[PDB]
Amino acid sequence: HGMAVTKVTVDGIEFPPTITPSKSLTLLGAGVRGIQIEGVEIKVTAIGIYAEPEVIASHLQKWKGKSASELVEDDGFFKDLVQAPVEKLARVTMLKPLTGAQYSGKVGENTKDALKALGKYSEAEEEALEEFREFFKTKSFPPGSTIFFHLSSPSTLQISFSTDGSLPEEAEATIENANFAAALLGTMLGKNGVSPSTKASVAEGISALLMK
């Protein structure tokens, strides 16, 4: 379409290249998260990572001139991405049906595991995890349903969702703990083995952005 950007498809799920919830965020990358059941791995969600493009580029200048392949193997790169003081959005679409307990059980344990490794799992983060699971407890997510994790600032995680990929008008639940938010976004980026495919895709998008 010339210089216009169009939808990006991940495993049948269409991701818009930008999302404006009041400024516009660009798709940095998108991949899938699998889960293991007994000896079997299955793909359960598609994850798209969005951020303000000029702003995030200006915070990652030190990474300029590195290819996606190089960036993928610098864990310090993804850490800088998480901690950059920029608005971010993780958009999560179900590939398979999940109850809210099934969804938040594993994502919550990924987040807890990340915090513990950092020495940042204290009473505050434990309460944030409890609030997180509380929110998801009675929800259900058929294929195509979408969860939006919006970090308006690094301090707060706004959660909302829709039965299709459409944008909600407002947050449904908000978790006000910076460490928990960061670690959850970290798992959405795919850090610590959660999603190598999302990590690789975000490294490609950012490598492209830094070159622009």
- Footprint on this chain of Cl ion (rule: CB under 5 A): 33, 42-43, 45, 92
Q: Which is nearer to Cl ion, 43 or 59 (CB)?
A: 43
- Minimal distance in Å, beta carbon 45 to Cl ion? 4
Q: For residue 53, what is the enclosing H or E element?
A: helix 53-58
Helix or strand or coil: residue 158?
A: strand
Distances (CA, A) of 143 to 11, 71, 96, 148: 12, 32, 5, 15
Q: Which is nearer to Cl ion, 76 or 143 (CB)?
A: 143
- Minimal distance in Å, beta carbon 195 to Cl ion? 8
- Minimal distance in Å, beta carbon 107 to Cl ion? 6
- Minimal distance in Å, beta carbon 142 to Cl ion? 15
- Minimal distance in Å, beta carbon 47 to Cl ion? 5
Q: Which is nearer to Cl ion, 33 or 88 (CB)?
A: 33
Q: CB atoms < 10 A from the CB of 169, how many?
A: 6
Q: Which is nearer to Cl ion, 33 or 199 (CB)?
A: 33
Longest dimension (CA), the chain: 52
**b vs e for 63-87, b when ≥16 Cβ sit within 10 Å of the residue's Cβ?**
beebebeebbeeeebbeebbebebb
Q: Which is nearer to Cl ion, 38 or 123 (CB)?
A: 38
Contact 130, 83 (CB under 8 A): no
